[PDB]
């Protein structure tokens, strides 16, 4: 079920059983890698890179094609963001909610959702701290969030 | 969330047996599930079973022979010794004539009679009779 909702939706992705690259795919590992490099230089998150790549270039799974994941490739070359994408989007959402609240304080619903989003941010940050992705003294603050994101 | 895949497998088998189904599908497969089903198979309480291999945790389809009464689990895997195994036998098994307690020992997953025969204790997994 959802972490912060009474919902039990099942919508996922069903990866096929065949890890083999399709015969009609002509792009090779280095070509897909350079395509990823130019998309990242355009400034797209790994999720967007995968979506664009699959929707237009016919690649099914970047990992199945190249042997590594999009984030792994970006880390290996050295042009990936220091802030994880999901954390970044979470702080962005919290910043938007707080910006809305400071103008509409009577939105008790918005205050509630802000509490939920902050809890998700802190739990994700705790996980990243234990995995050494974030510095051990990385603290999320309601005042510094707007500077941290955008 | 799902925290005991063996418990879920055993409950699914128990329900299918009580409904009289000829086959049942356990969705998450594990090595402990395979070994537990193997000892049940060797004693004859179930028939052939199949491990469907997806690239995730596989599935299992077991054939029920209709000769299973209860195949429950003991979820906290207690430390059992050869001195207190018989108290577990009395508490769980319906009688001394039949029924089995399965435990994982350093010699492998086995039933209590074989564990006593090779003189070792372990962690109780479940029971079936």
């Amino acid at each position: 079920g959802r972490m912060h909702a009474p919902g039990k939706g099942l919508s996922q992705s069903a990866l096929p059983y065949r890890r083999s690259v399709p015969t009609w795919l002509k792009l090779t590992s280095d070509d897909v890698k350079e395509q990823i490099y130019k998309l990242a230089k355009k400034g797209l998150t790994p999720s967007q890179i995968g979506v664009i790549l699959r929707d237009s270039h016919g690649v099914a799974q970047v990992r199945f094609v190249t042997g590594n994941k999009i984030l792994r490739i970006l880390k290996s070359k050295g042009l990936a963001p220091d802030l994880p994408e999901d954390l970044y989007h979470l702080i962005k959402k919290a910043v938007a909610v707080r910006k809305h609240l400071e103008r509409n304080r009577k939105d008790k619903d918005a205050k509630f959702r802000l509490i939920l989003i902050e809890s998700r941010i802190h739990r994700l940050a705790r996980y990243y701290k234990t995995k050494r992705v974030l510095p051990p003294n990385w603290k999320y603050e309601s005042s510094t969030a707007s500077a941290l994101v955008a | 969330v799902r925290m005991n895949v063996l418990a879920d497998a055993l409950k699914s088998i128990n329900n299918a047996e009580k409904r009289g189904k000829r086959q049942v599908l356990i969705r998450p497969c594990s090595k402990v599930i395979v070994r537990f089903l193997t000892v049940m198979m060797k004693h004859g309480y179930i028939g052939e079973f199949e491990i469907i291999d997806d690239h995730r945790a596989g599935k299992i389809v077991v054939n029920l022979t209709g000769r299973l009464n209860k195949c429950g689990v003991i979820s906290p895997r207690f430390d059992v010794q050869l001195k207190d195994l018989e108290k577990w036998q009395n508490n769980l098994l319906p009688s001394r004539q039949f029924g089995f307690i399965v435990l994982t020992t350093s010699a492998g997953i086995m039933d209590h009679e074989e564990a006593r025969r090779k003189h070792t204790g372990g962690k109780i997994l479940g029971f079936f009779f």
Binding site: - | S75, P76, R77, F78
Partner: protein, 141 residues
């Protein structure tokens, strides 16, 4: 339901000792207030001095006068009411006697139709009430 984890024994033990205060027997035996309130003070029997011979009406469905004695206990100086349990033993009882008193049978609770009487007389003037009733021995005149 209840927790079953391999290292939940602290929670299980704490919950047992926390919930054990919720039944009357354990609370009575382990708080001390009942022992303090007990006129016998945790003793099976106790000696006292007869202050007055009184009659107590039985409960509603019955109709009788139960013969009891007001008794001042020689220890801690408390006044209780003790039932004189036979056909004519109130005549054996007189004023200012050293009477041995026991509980009535169900652990500081009223018994039968007698209201608020928790004690009964076993001996009077150091001679057994049963002996006096049976006529085995006479009052020391």
């Amino acid at each position: 339901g209840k927790c079953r984890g391999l290292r939940t024994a602290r929670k299980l033990r704490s919950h047992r000792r926390d919930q054990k205060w919720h039944d009357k027997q354990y609370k009575k035996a382990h708080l001390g207030t009942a022992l303090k309130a007990n006129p016998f003070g945790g003793a099976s029997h106790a000696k006292g001095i007869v202050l007055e011979k009184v009659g107590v009406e039985a409960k509603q469905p019955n109709s009788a006068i139960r013969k009891c004695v007001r008794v001042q206990l020689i220890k801690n100086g408390k006044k209780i009411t003790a039932f004189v349990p036979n056909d004519g033993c109130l005549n054996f009882i007189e004023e200012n006697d050293e009477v041995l008193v026991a509980g009535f049978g169900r652990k500081g609770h009223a018994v039968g139709d007698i209201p608020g009487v928790r004690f009964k007389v076993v001996k009077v003037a150091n001679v057994s009430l049963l002996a006096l009733y049976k006529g085995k021995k006479e009052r020391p005149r």
